[PDB]
Each structure stands twice: as C-alpha cells, then as structure tokens.
Write an enzyme that holds these catalytic residues in place. Structure first.
Site, PDB file in Angstrom:
ATOM      1  CG  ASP A 117      -2.149  -2.101  12.912  1.00  0.00           C
ATOM      2  OD1 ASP A 117      -3.195  -1.690  12.791  1.00  0.00           O
ATOM      3  OD2 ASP A 117      -1.467  -1.064  11.985  1.00  0.00           O
ATOM      4  CD  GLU A 166      11.775   2.191   2.895  1.00  0.00           C
ATOM      5  OE1 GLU A 166      11.267   1.948   4.171  1.00  0.00           O
ATOM      6  OE2 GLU A 166      13.273   2.858   2.904  1.00  0.00           O
ATOM      7  CD  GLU A 192      -0.018  -2.740   4.501  1.00  0.00           C
ATOM      8  OE1 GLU A 192       0.447  -1.397   3.896  1.00  0.00           O
ATOM      9  OE2 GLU A 192       1.320  -4.014   5.920  1.00  0.00           O
ATOM     10  N   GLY A 223       3.432  -8.579  -2.587  1.00  0.00           N
ATOM     11  CA  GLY A 223       4.814  -8.545  -1.241  1.00  0.00           C
ATOM     12  C   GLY A 223       3.102  -9.107  -0.220  1.00  0.00           C
ATOM     13  CG  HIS A 282       1.899  -0.426  11.519  1.00  0.00           C
ATOM     14  ND1 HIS A 282       1.040  -0.606  10.702  1.00  0.00           N
ATOM     15  CD2 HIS A 282       3.421  -0.082  10.317  1.00  0.00           C
ATOM     16  CE1 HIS A 282       1.474  -1.115   9.384  1.00  0.00           C
ATOM     17  NE2 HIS A 282       2.495  -0.552   9.569  1.00  0.00           N
ATOM     18  CD  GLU A 336       7.598  -4.672  -9.623  1.00  0.00           C
ATOM     19  OE1 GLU A 336       8.111  -5.726  -9.048  1.00  0.00           O
ATOM     20  OE2 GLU A 336       7.660  -3.191  -8.910  1.00  0.00           O
ATOM     21  NE  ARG A 393      -1.342  -5.220   9.172  1.00  0.00           N
ATOM     22  CZ  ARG A 393      -0.365  -6.160   7.979  1.00  0.00           C
ATOM     23  NH1 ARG A 393      -0.374  -5.682   6.854  1.00  0.00           N
ATOM     24  NH2 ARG A 393      -0.759  -7.006   8.231  1.00  0.00           N
TER      25      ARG A 393
HETATM   26  N1  LIG Z   1       8.332  -5.546  -5.557  1.00  0.00           N
HETATM   27  C1  LIG Z   1       7.964  -6.382  -4.828  1.00  0.00           C
HETATM   28  N2  LIG Z   1       7.122  -7.380  -5.402  1.00  0.00           N
HETATM   29  C2  LIG Z   1       6.925  -8.157  -4.276  1.00  0.00           C
HETATM   30  N3  LIG Z   1       6.958  -8.600  -2.566  1.00  0.00           N
HETATM   31  C3  LIG Z   1       7.598  -6.952  -2.349  1.00  0.00           C
HETATM   32  C4  LIG Z   1       7.767  -6.149  -3.503  1.00  0.00           C
HETATM   33  N4  LIG Z   1       8.064  -4.860  -2.240  1.00  0.00           N
HETATM   34  C5  LIG Z   1       7.773  -5.221  -0.858  1.00  0.00           C
HETATM   35  N5  LIG Z   1       8.213  -6.043  -1.573  1.00  0.00           N
HETATM   36  C6  LIG Z   1       7.173  -7.101   0.340  1.00  0.00           C
HETATM   37  O1  LIG Z   1       5.732  -6.344   0.191  1.00  0.00           O
HETATM   38  C7  LIG Z   1       5.353  -6.762   1.768  1.00  0.00           C
HETATM   39  C8  LIG Z   1       4.467  -5.845   2.177  1.00  0.00           C
HETATM   40  C9  LIG Z   1       3.904  -5.900   3.770  1.00  0.00           C
HETATM   41  N6  LIG Z   1       3.189  -4.739   3.871  1.00  0.00           N
HETATM   42  C10 LIG Z   1       2.727  -6.711   3.233  1.00  0.00           C
HETATM   43  C11 LIG Z   1       3.397  -8.201   4.028  1.00  0.00           C
HETATM   44  C12 LIG Z   1       1.844  -8.610   4.281  1.00  0.00           C
HETATM   45  N7  LIG Z   1       0.964  -8.950   2.577  1.00  0.00           N
HETATM   46  C13 LIG Z   1       0.699  -7.926   5.035  1.00  0.00           C
HETATM   47  O2  LIG Z   1       0.073  -7.826   4.979  1.00  0.00           O
HETATM   48  O3  LIG Z   1       1.414  -8.867   6.703  1.00  0.00           O
HETATM   49  C14 LIG Z   1       7.108  -7.084   2.566  1.00  0.00           C
HETATM   50  O4  LIG Z   1       6.619  -8.145   2.578  1.00  0.00           O
HETATM   51  C15 LIG Z   1       7.894  -6.072   1.739  1.00  0.00           C
HETATM   52  O5  LIG Z   1       9.060  -7.413   1.550  1.00  0.00           O
END
Ligand SMILES: Nc1ncnc2c1ncn2[C@@H]1O[C@H](C[C@@H](N)CC[C@H](N)C(=O)O)[C@@H](O)[C@H]1O
Ligand SMILES: Nc1ncnc2c1ncn2[C@@H]1O[C@H](C[C@@H](N)CC[C@H](N)C(=O)O)[C@@H](O)[C@H]1O
Lengths: 327, 327
Positions: free
Chosen positions: B19, B120, B111, B46, B270, B97, B22
């Site tokens: 993407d 989600e 992100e 994340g 996306h 957390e 993004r």
């Molecule tokens: N509470 C949480 N603590 C740590 N990681 C998390 C949590 N909730 C979701 N995630 C992870 O957050 C990421 C969210 C993605 N949208 C971002 C991925 C990465 N930062 C990127 O921009 O390519 C995913 O890999 C999830 O597994």
C-alpha cells in the site's frame, strides 16, 4: 424489513451466469444438439437457477426435469414460470439420487464441474442419474472431460516473493530477509490454490494426462481409485519453476464438437486453474525435462473434497512427491 | 521440506507494505517530524515487520522500541539487523500493555487504524501506551483522525442487482425475477461491507462527522460510549441510493500537515471504505435531502469488533435506523 442469510447463494449463481464462456458454451452445446433433443425428455442434474433447463426447452425438448438440491430451486421455479415453460419444465427439489421422475429420460444435461474438475463436483450424482434414469443409448451433455497439466512460473507469485527484495529500492529499507519467510508461507504448504493464470505463466507445452468419457463403464470406480496419469514435457526457457497448474475441458457431442476450456491460454472462466506449488522455486532452463504423475482423488473425510497426489522429477533432480488437498 | 501455516501472516504484511499511499504517508510523515524526533526516543506500537521503526531511526531517533504482539516480531528483528540498526532499534515481543521499557519515550508512532477506522484497531493500545510510556508534551504520529460519511449509489452493486434483468438480452432467458432475490441477499443484512468505491459512487458531498485528537483527555471513554455525530447533505442527482460509505483520514503533526486519506475520491488504499447498505435501494433526485447520525461502537462480545449504528432520513421519508456490525 427482514434480514436474510443468502448472500452466498446469489453470489455463486451470479458468478456462474456472468461466466460468459461457461454459459454460452452450454447454450450453444445444447442448441447444437437440437436434433437429438427435439421432442425428447431431459433431466437437468443440479439445475440451479434453471437456465440450462430453459436452454433445453428452447432447443425443442418436450419435457425437462430440473432437479436441484439447494434452496435456489425455488428461484428456478419462478424463472421457469416467467419464461412461460411451467407446462414442460418441472423443478424438483432434493438430491437427484432420491428424486422420483415419472419416466426415464432421453438425455441428461449437467454443469457438474468443480475446481480442478472434481472438487465438490456433482459428477458422481450425474453418473448415478445416468444409471437410474437415462434410457439406453441416451445422450449426456457434455459427453467427456479432459484433464491437463503444465509446469508454471507464476508471474504473480514471482512478484510476491521478490517484493521484499524490492522494498529497499522504493522505501530505503532492506527487507530482503522477508523473502525466505514469504516463500515458506506462500509455497510451504500442501493446499491446492485456485488462481487464474495466463500464457505468460506456462513453462512448457500443456499435457493431457487423462480423459473421462462420462458414459463409460467403470467410471464411478475410477473416481474412487483415482483419475490421472503420467506426463512429460520440456521447459520453454529460463525461469523459476513454482509448480504445476491443472485444468480441464469438457466436450459436447457434435451437431466439430464444442469445447468448453478452462486453460490459461483460453478465455478466463470462473473455474480459473488449480495450482500445485512446490515447497520452493526450482530454477529451470530451456529444454529442462520435467516428468511426473498426477492423480485426482477423493479425500478420506469427504469424497467431494479434492485431493491431488503429485509425483514429479525436474531435470536430474530426484523424483519427489507432494500430496495436496483443497481447503 | 516442512509445511507451515503462515500464509495469512505474510499476506497481511505484504498488503500493508505494498500500500504505497499508506507506507509513503508514514515515511514522509515521520521524516517531516525529524526536528522533533532527532536524538529522541520512540515507541512504535504494533511494529509488525519493523518498517516504521526503521523510518524513525532514519529520521534521526536515538532509540526506538518496536513492540509487536504477533509472531511477525521475529521478522522485524531480522529486518532491523539487516539495516544495521540493532544498536538503536529494539524489538520487544508481546502486547504493549505489558511490555517493559527501560525509559519513557519522547514519541509514539503507530499504524493502528482498522477497517472503518476502528475495526480491530490498535487505538486503545496506543492510548494505553501514551498514558504509561509517553513523556509529558510528547509526540503522537499520526496526531488525529477524522471520520467521513457520504451517501452512495454503488455502481458495482447497481450492476449486480440489474444483472438478472439483463440476462434476457444476452441469453434469451428472462431472469428478472431474480432481482428481488438478489436485493434481499446483497442488501437485506446488517453486515458492514468493506469495498472500494470511487467518485462515481458518491451521491452527495462527503460530511465530516467526527474528529479524534489522539492526545485528548477522555478519548478512551468516548471510544467505549461511541464515536460519531450527525450529518446532513443534499444529493447530486437522480440515482438509486444504496446506503452510505464511511471512511477516515489521519493527520501527521506539521513539519501543511500531511494527511493520509482513505476517501473514494483519493488514491486507493488497502482500507477501502466501510459500506452501510440499506435493505433496498431508495430512489433519490437532485437536491434530495439526507440527514442522519452515525455512531461507531464496540461490539458487546468484543470491543474490537466494529459496530455502526446508523440513523437516517431520506427526503420526506420517516427516519429509519439500522444497526450494523463487522463480520
Ligand atoms: N496491543 C498490541 N501490542 C503490540 N502489537 C500489537 C497490538 N495490537 C496489534 N498489534 C500489532 O500491530 C500491528 C499493526 C499494523 N497495522 C502495523 C504494522 C507496522 N507498524 C507497519 O506499519 O507495517 C500488527 O502487526 C499487529 O500484530
Ligand atoms: N446431488 C445433487 N442433486 C441435485 N442438485 C445438486 C446435487 N449436487 C449439487 N447440486 C446442485 O447442482 C448445481 C450445480 C451448478 N454448477 C449448476 C447450476 C445450473 N445448472 C447452471 O448451469 O447455472 C448447484 O445449484 C448445486 O446446488
């Protein structure tokens, strides 16, 4: 108003009818057999929305029994009424295995093919109906199916695997290490993948490895024991071999026979092709020999869940085996 | 070799990185804040494959903590090593957390956005991390999100519904009765549908119905109680109204602010848009007034499963309500 849970039902039938290649092949295949159908009776096995039954009536059938097990039979009955055919096309709910017809029929028409020809296909039901309801010397439309295999260098997969090594050139971050990870994930499994290819993906001349004449003695037992055969081919040029594609054609009895193909070299259909990926790409060259054996099998839990057993030998590498199933 | 079950894991991260809208928005959003990041510490909530953490290091961050709960953290650690940043970017597995950092941080990058912004989404985790680990006056990237709604005449849905009435013109079989069936199935449900639209689908000027400043007091409670607001608009012209599209943008603090939009009027992402279909189409005309209220809510079983409560009034019709959830 009310909420319903039939999104899936409409989408499946929309996909079929909007498949121009499929629907026009049946329309013409049926019409080309008008001399055999005119004034005769037909059983449509798995009539769905009823469109093939109506094609049969339009080709001159005296009477058509449209048997459909899913909820969509109700829509078929409405379609029949709307086309003024309620007097000659009769929609019967339930499986064809237990339906009661008032007479044996001169012909069976069916669109029974599934992904990889035999996944969740109605073929065993068509054969049951043939035995029980088709008159001796009666017609089956289509009459035969042929199965093909080709080695492939899947251009979309090549792009997905190579993507990670290209991130540095687009964002200034090296992610080339993600390539082994992506390979394990996208290829290191034993699922059959349904995907549409084109000629750009085909790495050697496609090989016919089986033919099924649907009227032939013993076919029900061949389906249980496995449909397939050996193949051999020689690669067109240098590329990563990713595995093999399997597809089919069906042939309508002649008025040359009309063929409905799902080859990647021919117009796309909703069946796409069934792809059998190796665990990782194998480099090949012009004239690299590839041989093997492909068998289409029932799954033990479910005879209508397609299993494909692949044996293959690339060049001087040793023969390998991979056992695939639809998910 | 071995078989693995990580097709999903690679595909999700491939989708994100491929993407361009993004990934380039984050690259530039982070780089534009180099004066705020240089020599400072960052928490990447994340971190996924680690690419945003590396962008932060490249913008001059002294130290980056890359926290990732899913299995993909292992690949992030490899990515960090491959870019020679193992001394300043530290990948920490597990939920943010409960992670233990050795210091509070100057900035949080994340992100976190999901479909419909809040499906989600990691937002509650980002806010938890802000409270626990961000220094006073610290930076959040992005800093704010805005939510938009527009009435739509979905051209693809119009084609799907109208398909059945066109079968007669293509195959000589009337199937117009399938239209009511297809309408019930495709629209007579309360699922949020994620689909990409374009400007051709937008039936009135999009309306901003909420804004979330991520640093603001009380946001965690607003998320629990529902994010949203009222809207009003006037239709562009005559069309079937199918419902409403919801989308978002996020804004990075300034070096004008950089905005990452998921509007159908802007380059595709996306995230696509979140579509809220009425039970059946409603004819509208130029200057037909449409007003309503949209609230984004947690589901009772799962606060991260998005619910959207829609109240709407089209023209002189009475106000109606429809309660949607992601499936
Ligand atoms: N509470 C949480 N603590 C740590 N990681 C998390 C949590 N909730 C979701 N995630 C992870 O957050 C990421 C969210 C993605 N949208 C971002 C991925 C990465 N930062 C990127 O921009 O390519 C995913 O890999 C999830 O597994
Ligand atoms: N044993 C069975 N008896 C009756 N119907 C079946 C059986 N197995 C599958 N079906 C139905 O067979 C249909 C197969 C479709 N491929 C064909 C639909 C229709 N003939 C068409 O060409 O558009 C589906 O509607 C299935 O629900």
């Amino acid at each position: 108003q009310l909420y319903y849970e039939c999104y899936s039902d409409v989408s499946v039938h929309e996909e079929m009818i909007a498949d121009q290649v499929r629907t026009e092949a049946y329309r013409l295949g049926i019409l080309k057999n008008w001399a055999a159908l005119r004034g005769k009776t037909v059983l449509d096995v798995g009539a769905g929305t009823g469109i093939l039954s109506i094609f049969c009536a339009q080709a001159g059938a005296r009477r058509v029994y449209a048997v459909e097990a899913s909820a969509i039979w109700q829509q078929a009955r409405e379609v029949v009424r709307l086309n003024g055919l309620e007097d000659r096309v009769h929609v019967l709910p339930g499986p064809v295995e237990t339906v009661e017809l008032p007479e044996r029929v001169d012909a069976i028409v069916s669109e029974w093919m599934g992904y990889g020809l035999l996944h969740e296909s109605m073929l065993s039901s068509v054969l049951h109906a043939r035995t029980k309801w088709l008159k001796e010397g009666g017609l089956l439309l289509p009459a035969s199916a042929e199965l093909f295999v080709a080695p492939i260098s899947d251009q979309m997969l090549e792009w997905r695997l190579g993507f990670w090594s290209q991130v540095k050139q687009h964002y200034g971050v090296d992610m080339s290490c993600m390539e082994s990870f992506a390979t394990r994930c996208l290829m290191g499994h034993s699922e059959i993948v349904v995907q549409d290819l084109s000629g750009e993906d085909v790495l050697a001349r496609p090989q016919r490895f089986a033919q099924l004449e649907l009227a032939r003695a013993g076919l029900e037992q061949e389906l249980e024991a496995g449909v397939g055969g050996r193949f051999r081919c020689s690669c067109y040029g240098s590329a990563p071999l990713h595995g093999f594609a399997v597809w089919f054609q069906v042939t309508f009895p002649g008025g040359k026979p009309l063929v409905l193909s799902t080859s990647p070299l021919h117009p796309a259909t909703h069946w796409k092709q069934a792809l059998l990926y190796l665990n990782e790409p194998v480099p090949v060259e012009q004239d690299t020999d590839i041989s093997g054996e492909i068998t289409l099998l029932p799954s033990p839990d479910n005879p209508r869940r397609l299993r494909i057993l692949l044996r293959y030998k690339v060049g001087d590498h040793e023969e390998k085996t991979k056992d695939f199933a639809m998910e």
